[PDB]
Amino acid sequence: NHYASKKSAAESMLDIALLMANASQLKAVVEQGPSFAFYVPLVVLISISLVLQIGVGVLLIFLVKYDLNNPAKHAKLDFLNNLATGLVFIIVVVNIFITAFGV
Amino acid sequence: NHYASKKSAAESMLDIALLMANASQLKAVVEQGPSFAFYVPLVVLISISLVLQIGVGVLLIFLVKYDLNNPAKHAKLDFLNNLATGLVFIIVVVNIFITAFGV
Amino acid sequence: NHYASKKSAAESMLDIALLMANASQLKAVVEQGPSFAFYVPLVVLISISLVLQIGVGVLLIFLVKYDLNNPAKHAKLDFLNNLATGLVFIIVVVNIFITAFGV
Amino acid sequence: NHYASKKSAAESMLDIALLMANASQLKAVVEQGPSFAFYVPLVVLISISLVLQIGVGVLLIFLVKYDLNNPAKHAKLDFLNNLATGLVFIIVVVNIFITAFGV
Amino acid sequence: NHYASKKSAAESMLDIALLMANASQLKAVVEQGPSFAFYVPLVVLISISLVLQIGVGVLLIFLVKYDLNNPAKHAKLDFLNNLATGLVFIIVVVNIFITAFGV
Amino acid sequence: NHYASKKSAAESMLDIALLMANASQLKAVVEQGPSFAFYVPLVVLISISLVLQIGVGVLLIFLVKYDLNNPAKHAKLDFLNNLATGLVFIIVVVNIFITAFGV
């Protein structure tokens, strides 16, 4: 008898992000790096990775909830799917760079 | 009697980017910074600024050339315009940070 | 009961890239090289290899998802397939160069 | 009374490339750099810049000569124009980096 | 349930090139040569050999995929086959020269 | 009253090549280089440049003389023109490298 949506919202975005493992490691690497010494090339990758994770999450959720809000949008969905897919691919590349602990 | 498009393409994107002044300063700041000493907080801003400049340029050009490619896209144009405008606003904020030569 | 697409997008591009083995080695070679000494001719090959991997991935995904978006595109598909195939062939050549640990 | 096409071909591509000024400077910078000392970050930019100049030139010429070879290609032309424009924009960014004589 | 084409493209060109053994040896010879001493006459042969391998691979793949793209091309196929065959023959001659470890 | 074709053939190819200025300089550079000292990176460019000049000359002359030998070849002409144009563009790039007297 608890018809709230706070729990609904948190689970909805959490399942739409699913970056907990990705971000969690990103926190350790960006924490260990500066702690050990001054290494510039890795923090940049972390900064970009999280930024793109936000952008893709922003785009994915909106069209995931609905696709008939506008009078007609049938082919443009692929373009947004195309754009989001490219962002994920970039995220994959950078995530591979950082886990190597080097450029 | 030179019906090429190389000149057309370069001018088209150059007028669609118009970041020459923005980027040019970004090059000097990212060059002077590391030259003087190890300062981490500024290079990150430069990295993000150029990244967003690319993203907005990518989005702007496609819909600028045409808007009737899909069967119907009349209200979604605002959403893309909304997204691009937000990116520019972020670019403005970071550009203001870096020109201050501090966090 | 999790109708998300984040997992869908990541798997889609990951299976469309399948460069994890290729890139992973690229990270080690580009890390060991500068670590040992200054060797210019190998890093360039790594830089080009990943660049082309991105370009081919960009082209492959778009037409893989659909091929009837435009009013009619039946013969142009081969041209894009021709272009992507050439990029892969170039990627093969450079990948062979770098694994030789020499020019 | 010289109905050859060698002169036609050379002028056609030369006007389609128009990188003589761009490349010519690229030669001096990539020559002075290694001559002075070992500086890695600049040669990579030169290598990428020329590579993209080739790719865009490859794409531009084919569709510039004709656009009705296939049964119908009216909307895909924009996609190729979109792809080529992005490559030029990348070329602009790197060209700006290298002329700064720094990262 | 993985309807991708990255794997398709890589295998397609790899079976269309089948130079892995040829190139692999080319890497060792071009690596050992300069390592031992300054010997000019062999590297040139390696450079030409790989160049022709690219050219023939470029020509072979396009017409291998299809031969009815144009309104009619029945006799010209032999000319392209003639041209590609000559390139392979040249590749054979140079490959024989280099394996002799001499001019 | 001299209905020979030796003079016709020599002029025909000479006007179809028009590399006398290009080759003539190529001879001096490839002569001065080894004379001064052992410099590997320039002779390779000369070797490739002349090779491509031959290939383009081979292709250009055949289709220049006639284009109706086969039952029908109307669209394939562009492909050959496309291939030859690319070779010239490569020749331009290398010719620019060598005239710089450096890599």
Residue numbers in the entry:
A (entry chain F), B (entry chain C), C (entry chain E), D (entry chain B), E (entry chain D), F (entry chain A): 39 to 141
From the reporting publication:
NINJ1 is a 16-kDa plasma membrane protein that is evolutionarily conserved and found in all higher eukaryotes. Our data thus suggest that, during lytic cell death, the extracellular α-helices of NINJ1 insert into the plasma membrane to polymerize NINJ1 monomers into amphipathic filaments that rupture the plasma membrane. The membrane protein NINJ1 is therefore an interactive component of the eukaryotic cell membrane that functions as an in-built breaking point in response to activation of cell death.
Notably, the experimental density comprised two identical hNINJ1 filaments, which were packed together in an antiparallel arrangement. The hNINJ1 filament is organized by stacking of adjacent protomers in a fence-like manner. The two antiparallel helices α3 and α4 (residues 79–103 and 114–138, respectively) form the core of the filament. When analysing the surface hydrophobicity of the NINJ1 filament, we observed that one face of the filament is hydrophilic whereas the other face is hydrophobic. These properties directly explain how two hNINJ1 filaments have stacked via their hydrophobic faces to result in the soluble double filament resolved by cryo-EM.
